[PDB]
Design a protein around this ligand. Structure first.
Ligand SMILES: Nc1ncnc2c1ncn2[C@@H]1O[C@H](CSCC[C@H](N)C(=O)O)[C@@H](O)[C@H]1O
Ligand SMILES: Nc1ncnc2c1ncn2[C@@H]1O[C@H](CSCC[C@H](N)C(=O)O)[C@@H](O)[C@H]1O
Lengths: 291, 291
């Protein structure tokens, strides 16, 4: 067995303290080991992001504009969690595909079947006015050309919507498929437990202060670094059994999930963080029908 | 006579401490009172900007890419000034129009007759590599649509060229002709002595640290402020005779010119700042054939 003792898991990209040469054969390896693993991946990251905003007092009264939301099964859980905590939020889910019917019939949630373009972004901005907007983007085109186009759309979402905070999908294109350097918004590069086995995708979390928008350039050399750090995390780290983690499941991803879930607020009072987490995880797995 | 005592002139937009309702009749007022006033306006601002970079140690060894440089008569003075100070700089002047023949025959200055597009920007970036670039932009299309397009080109100049510093033309569109909010790079809004009588144009000066690029949003309310502050400066301030300014010409623009020129480095040693400034001004006026 692949055992180890860890104090904490890597929460952000910057924390990854080692790298490995990406082995292209890894793309043939089993990408997922849990049913509905993708909805779980999204649910944990968005619960993490939103709980943070609540902590900063910027969630209540906001309209959450989620682009690339369909099917959105896991979003039903997110909505219920904050709704039951008393937080007042309007959800606007936009995708060209249809949403899971469990999302219908909620006065606080608007479903839109539209592929967004800059022009459409302008109209919903005028229509949302004057509510404070929190943007969550998970749009999908993929080629380096596809990626760049997605990142270009995400930056236009921020400039037109002018959100108070944002969570953006972020996967650096492969250095060997580099087209040109580009800019992404400045934010925390949140690592994702239950991401596919060899995925180099993270979520870019930003909170907007003042009327400024800080961007950061991404070069091919950055692309090489992303690839090696993420490869090391996926191949080595995520395959560890954290033996000093006293929890029903000790695999790295559960240890990592524990640290995100410990930041989530509940109405129920627990004697320990472990009890709250086991509770939230049990709850999340039951909702998603994950054994 | 319109007299006053001033400690210093307004050097930056932010310093303007008063406003006035813009009177559209001002557009019919004499815009210039000096021959070649526009070359003088540009020369002082660029001497100011470049001397700053020299002071920060980022001028020497840089390639200055000036887009919208033609005719560029005043640029001959700038080039000579730094060349004679021993600073090593390459100049690359690009415009679709032709440059003043006084700019030919200098091994350190390359003249290009081309209207720049993003694609062309990419090629010169690859060709300049690996020199450090200092961008100066004075491109001209004007409608609010024209302005926006110019500002859009200027931001693309920064992302492709990735300069260590930049001076960009900046005039906020009129609030009553607003089209949409947009972003300009963050920088100092340098005020311009000898700008046309009622011009609201300033120069945006930025120095790029790290791999970050900070932008700032400009809204219609900002547009109203720009208009009123600049109108107050033009109508009231620039029409003052600074009587406590012991200098051959006491008009505000000369008082303002004095503060920019006092920051310029010379080989010659002077007993006072006043002597250096009178010298630089005499020199500048003789070069431009201004009486
Ligand atoms: N321009 C656009 N506007 C809206 N959705 C878009 C888009 N282009 C792509 N997308 C959407 O991006 C999605 C990526 S998969 C997203 C899954 C979703 N985040 C979840 O909660 O289940 C697809 O459903 C796709 O239609
Ligand atoms: N795409 C582009 N590339 C190059 N120059 C451009 C441009 N579009 C406009 N311009 C130029 O912008 C200039 C504005 S007037 C500039 C005067 C100049 N700064 C001086 O030193 O004298 C014009 O000469 C015009 O041709």
């Amino acid at each position: 067995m692949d055992v180890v003792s860890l104090d904490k898991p890597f929460m952000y990209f910057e924390e990854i303290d080692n790298e490995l040469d990406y082995e292209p054969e890894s793309a043939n390896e089993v990408a997922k080991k849990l049913p509905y693993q993708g909805q779980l991946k999204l649910l944990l990251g968005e619960l993490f992001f939103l709980s943070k905003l609540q902590r900063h007092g910027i969630l209540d009264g906001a309209t959450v504009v989620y682009i690339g939301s369909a099917p959105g099964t896991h979003i039903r859980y997110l909505r219920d969690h904050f709704y039951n905590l008393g937080v007042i939020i309007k959800w606007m889910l936009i995708d060209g595909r249809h949403h899971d019917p469990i999302l219908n019939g909620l006065r606080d949630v608007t479903l839109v079947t539209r592929f967004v373009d800059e022009e459409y972004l302008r109209s919903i901005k005028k229509q949302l006015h004057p509510s404070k907007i929190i943007l969550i983007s998970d749009v999908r085109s993929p080629s380096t050309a596809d990626l760049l186009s997605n990142y270009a759309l995400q930056n236009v979402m921020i400039s037109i919507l002018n959100p108070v905070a944002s969570s953006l999908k972020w996967r650096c294109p492969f250095p060997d498929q580099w087209i040109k350097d580009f800019y992404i918004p400045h934010g925390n590069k949140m690592l994702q437990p239950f991401a596919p086995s060899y995925s180099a995708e993270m979520r870019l979390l930003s909170i907007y202060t003042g009327e400024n928008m800080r961007l950061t350039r991404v070069t091919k050399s950055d692309a090489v670094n992303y690839e090696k750090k993420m490869y090391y995390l996926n191949k080595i780290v995520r395959n560890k059994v954290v033996v000093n983690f006293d929890y029903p499941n000790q695999e790295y991803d559960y240890f990592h999930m524990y640290f995100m879930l410990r930041t989530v607020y509940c109405n129920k009072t627990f004697p320990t963080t472990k009890a709250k987490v086991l509770f939230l995880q049990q709850s999340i797995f039951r909702f998603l029908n994950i054994p």
